[PDB]
Design a protein around this ligand. Structure first.
Ligand SMILES: C[C@](O)(C(=O)O)[C@H](CC(=O)O)C(=O)O
Ligand SMILES: C[C@](O)(C(=O)O)[C@H](CC(=O)O)C(=O)O
Ligand SMILES: [Zn+2]
Ligand SMILES: [Zn+2]
Lengths: 198, 198
């Protein structure tokens, strides 16, 4: 990898983890001193970081960490509902029986840690590389910094496991229509859970 | 912008336009001489270009322009159906009456040029910035290099205008469910039109 890519993921991880507070003023000088890179590759990283809605550009000031507002949550979970739901539909037709059985194995294994492995197996089982990039590469970063800033309720881990199993049941039955619907409801339950603390 | 961003869009435009043939071996030396940049920022551009499925990485060789195969078309138009269809649903509830009337004005205005403005107004009318980036910033680049490599049939421009107007009619009636369905059918008609020459 190049240095421009190194400082990218180091800053991106500091934003998703809350290390840099949502809404902070990003100081390009003190950041170039923390990692020791010139302003060329640094501005290259901020531009990408603004593209993924992690940083936001202010005209007369500079870059700022995203507001982490309610409108941005609607924007994010909307796309995630349409994409993950379709991932369940495609995974139900395209997953081999070996991938399905391994999916139940992963689910049988079980702030909050979460079950990203469950969703990741389905997105991969959908057989769409572009879908995997848009979900796990772009959307899931802004998703995580919401779940990190706002912890779930103590009954949410139990509720999501039930939702996960019924989704798996529809996928294992080759019922993409039901799996897509069950996936959508589970995404909407996740958004309402986060909307409980704003 | 930085130089790393300049050579990015210059190569990306040379791929979408067919200037660089689909499936060609990208020569990092002769490319670094064409634009005059070091291998650091050059490798930075190829990495992003591979992310958007424009270049593909070969282990023991290097980077190659995407195969432009049939499987990649299915991968691409799948995501476009789910995203653009949802864009029509959201645009039907969220577009102001001024944006709708202006949408009919744009449609009333009318290889092939295409009606990207029509789709762009709807994606913007959806009120989702992430949706606009994923559609117009990532997917629509790989879309264009398919429509450039494979020209439509002479009756396709006429057929798409009818599809566009019925979509506009459902949006102007605040019928997101019908607009989404009509949008999906029009996306599927576009894919079959391209599938006619492979
Ligand atoms: C636990 C979870 O199901 C997950 O898969 O990580 C969560 C649910 C939630 O946060 O309410 C998710 O999918 O976002
Ligand atoms: C003409 C078109 O409707 C367009 O909006 O550019 C095309 C249709 C097609 O290519 O068959 C499109 O949307 O892809
Ligand atoms: Zn979950
Ligand atoms: Zn069209």
């Amino acid at each position: 990898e190049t240095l421009s890519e190194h400082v990218f993921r180091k800053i991106q991880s500091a934003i998703v983890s809350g290390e840099i507070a949502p809404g902070s003023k990003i100081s390009e000088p003190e950041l170039a001193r923390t990692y020791g890179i010139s302003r060329g590759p640094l501005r290259e990283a901020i531009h990408r970081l603004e593209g993924l809605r992690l940083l936001v550009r202010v005209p007369h000031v500079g870059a700022r960490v995203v507001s982490l507002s309610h409108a941005e949550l609607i924007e994010l979970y909307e796309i995630r509902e349409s994409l993950e739901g379709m991932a369940c539909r495609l995974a139900a037709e395209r997953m081999s029986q070996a991938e399905i059985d391994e999916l139940r194995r992963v689910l049988d294994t079980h702030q909050q840690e979460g079950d990203y492995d469950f969703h990741y197996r389905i997105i991969q089982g959908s057989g769409n590389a572009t879908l995997t990039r848009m979900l796990c590469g772009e959307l899931y970063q802004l998703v995580r910094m919401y779940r990190i800033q706002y912890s779930t309720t103590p009954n949410r881990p139990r509720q999501a496991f039930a939702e996960h199993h019924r989704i798996l049941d529809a996928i294992a039955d080759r019922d993409g229509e039901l799996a897509e619907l069950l996936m959508r409801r589970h995404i909407s339950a996740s958004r309402r859970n986060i909307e409980r603390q704003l």
